[PDB]
Amino acid sequence: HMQSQAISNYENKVEKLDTSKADEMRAAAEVYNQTLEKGVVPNYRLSEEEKRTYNSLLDVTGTGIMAYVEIPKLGTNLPIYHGTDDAILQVAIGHIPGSSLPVGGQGTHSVISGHRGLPSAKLFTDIDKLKNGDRFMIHVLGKTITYQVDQTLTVEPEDISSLAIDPDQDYCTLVTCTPYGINSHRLLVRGHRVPNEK
């Protein structure tokens, strides 16, 4: 509802950027991605300096919306905020700081999550319905990037080893809470980069 309008605002801002500036902003995100450690358990603890850098990238709207995710099977369209934005994470999807920014490329693994969302917000609560072969799309600065689901893991909240950046791959993982028993777990739905469809 508010998400619908955040996405429209994002699109309007994008449509007003010159292609040159869109490309410059995207390239700056790719350059940052290249600086991240790879082949190791991710470090999701940023220093203040690193947070400053992170917050200044892909801030199209000035409200911290970097992109939006589309999941046709679920009818999903959701704005993706910086994961330091915090208040807004109770009602919107957050990119996990320290993971690759969602612009794709070899040697990237971006993580976007609804795990801090309020139960009533319904963020990614349907992703357990995704099967291997289903598609989702990140729309970032006028460019569309497509992922095909290839993995579905239910893990204890501490187990982030599968979120490591592989230098030969381009992955995006969608994350949500999955409550069962008297405890809380995490569902990680990974996709690998594939070409955009016609």
Query: What's the min distance (Å) between Cβ of 5 and Na ion?
Result: 31
Is residue 31 part of the contact set for Na ion (CB under 5 A)?
no
Residue 97 interacts with Na ion (CB under 5 A): yes or no: no
Six-digit token string for 131: 């099967």
Which position among 37, 86, 128, 156 is part of the footprint of Na ion (CB under 5 A)?
37
Q: Which one is catalytic: 82, 109, 115, 139?
A: 115
Per rule CB under 5 A, is residue 146 in the interface with Na ion?
A: no
Residue with smaller CB distance to Na ion, 91 or 147: 147
Structure tokens at 47: 């220093």
For position 100 contacting Na ion by CB under 5 A, the verdict is: yes
- Binding characters for Na ion, 149-188, by CB under 5 A (x = yes): ----------------x-----------------------
Residues in 41-60 that interact with Na ion by CB under 5 A: 42
Query: Is 177 assigned a catalytic role?
Result: yes
Annotated active-site residue in 82, 95, 109, 177: 177
User: Any binding-site annotation on 185?
Assistant: yes
Cα gap 138→26, rounded to integer Å: 13
Angle at the Cα of 65 from the Cα atoms of 60 and 71, rounded to 5 degrees: 120
Catalytic site includes residue 172: no
Give whichever of 12 and 169 is closer to Na ion, judged by the CB atom.
169
Binding-site residues for Zn(2+) sit at 185
> Which residues in this chain contact Na ion in the complex, by CB under 5 A?
33, 36-37, 42, 100, 108, 165
Binding-site residues sit at 185
Give the residue numbers annotated as catalytic, written as ranges.
115, 177
